[PDB]
Subunit: 92 residues, 6 copies
């Protein structure tokens, strides 16, 4: 019970603050779905092109799965930073 | 006309690809609105607390405007990386 | 009371988990002190060298205050990522 | 001998500067130990929960090992940036 | 034809702008070659030292391939950010 | 003399290693010049458009100076990471 009191820097949050944090989290869920959809597109693109070496080489050179992972991490850490701006912990 | 042909690594894109890129951009617009709303909350919070030194010191120590800017940059660069995964330029 | 239940993805945490999170936060406090000490060194270095244009130009070109801010942000976001690995939210 | 003279932008450093850089490196060693401890916790958590599919799915969805790696990289690059603020190379 | 008009925020670009963007891309190609050369050095270093456990352990602890990948990503995203400063999309 | 021995994790470097590190630094100097050129373009663009509010608003919304600074930092930290892959310090 009341885990936050045990965590350093955590402070009490009002309903407005919690609602804003949850708004950020919800938008992120939409990004997650978009990322899954892009991953699904990539899976199809790769499959459609196996045996067509030129396209497989082009896709390997574009590295789209690596870039999608980069984007996912930036989206998640940006969400965390916005939420920190709302929640405002009293610690480094 | 056809600026992309002049830009290195840029390739022709199908309507499905362009639609996915635009989907990413649209979700980002929603993030922009959320960020503005958080900035507006912060402006109000600061204003409501001027002359209450303890709260002004607490807010200064939490640095919420800096964290909001950090989050904005991560959201934008993540969008760029997801869009690169869709668009797949043929260059470093 | 029990703010975490209202925040999406947040889950109950055991004492061991909270103790590890707090360990991360404590180490960060040590980094904060080190960063302040470096900022103090920089303030002195700059002061000692005003009127010695060559050194002031060299310091301006090294941009040490900007680099210290870069380091501070990376330390804080790394702390946040380690703490997320311990706390393990059930959301994007 | 005197490798630094051969490296562009590297400049001579006083004992105080070297001591501060080493202070940063030492604090980092403490972070390394903490990261290993978290990795050990994660290994145990996973092991304790194999055959309990719901928990294994939850852990896979939280991606704590990926987040721990993210945190490690941010800690290391932040250390590098703080050390650059102390050492102040005369190059881009 | 004219894919840019279909992509949100994309604007018409003059020849000077496109030439600057391509200048960035070209410099990046030079970085790609340097990165390949470093990867080749690492491959040789590892090979030359197999059976010399102490050196293999030292290399594993330095993690140079991971650091090279980190550097590659930072170079590519920095290129993207400079190009965005030139191209100036009218969107988030 | 021999400052590196006093810095933790620093190891002796061969001429080939130092030459590769310097190659990275040199390429970076080329990036610095390109960044200055882009900054100069931006200064001119802004100047040419003062009193044309629509263009000044568009430029303010694109935030090209902020994006150029983002790119500069990513280029510099990527250089640092590549150089760490060559130099291979024996510390966290
Ligand atoms: N002042 C204050 N009071 C709070 O109650 C509170 N709760 C969170 N925060 C801070 O918000 C910011 C963003 O949170 P996010 O959920 O994105 O990341 C969180 C989330 O991924 C995870 N986490 C924290 N608590 C829990 C929890 N109870 N369950 C699951 N995951 C958790 O660990 C990350 C980092 O936490 P901190 O980096 O220590 O504090 C956070 C951070 O500064 C708070 N700040
Ligand atoms: N002016 C100046 N004089 C110096 O003697 C000096 N030594 C280091 N630095 C700069 O400090 C900053 C942080 O150093 P860190 O050790 O975290 O990263 C270092 C470290 O990981 C690695 N490295 C450099 N020299 C060695 C070395 N001799 N042995 C092992 N690793 C080394 O390569 C990284 C990047 O070096 P640079 O990015 O070229 O210069 C560094 C950087 O700006 C110096 N700056
Ligand atoms: N205003 C404007 N008009 C343009 O014509 C234009 N073209 C690109 N940009 C923006 O430049 C910046 C850097 O571009 P880079 O090529 O590094 O990344 C690009 C590139 O990796 C990829 N991409 C975009 N279009 C194509 C394309 N036609 N073919 C291949 N890859 C493409 O997707 C990345 C992100 O694009 P955005 O993040 O939506 O817009 C870019 C970005 O802001 C433009 N901005």
């Amino acid at each position: 019970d009341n885990q936050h009191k045990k965590i350093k820097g955590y402070r009490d949050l009002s309903q407005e603050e919690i609602d804003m944090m949850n708004r950020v989290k919800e938008l992120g869920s939409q990004f997650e779905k978009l990322i899954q959809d892009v991953s699904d597109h990539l899976r199809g693109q790769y499959n459609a092109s196996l045996h067509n070496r030129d396209e497989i080489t082009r896709i390997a050179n574009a590295e789209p799965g690596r870039w999608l992972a980069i984007g996912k991490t930036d989206i998640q850490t940006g969400m965390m930073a916005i939420i920190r701006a709302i929640a405002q912990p009293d610690s480094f």
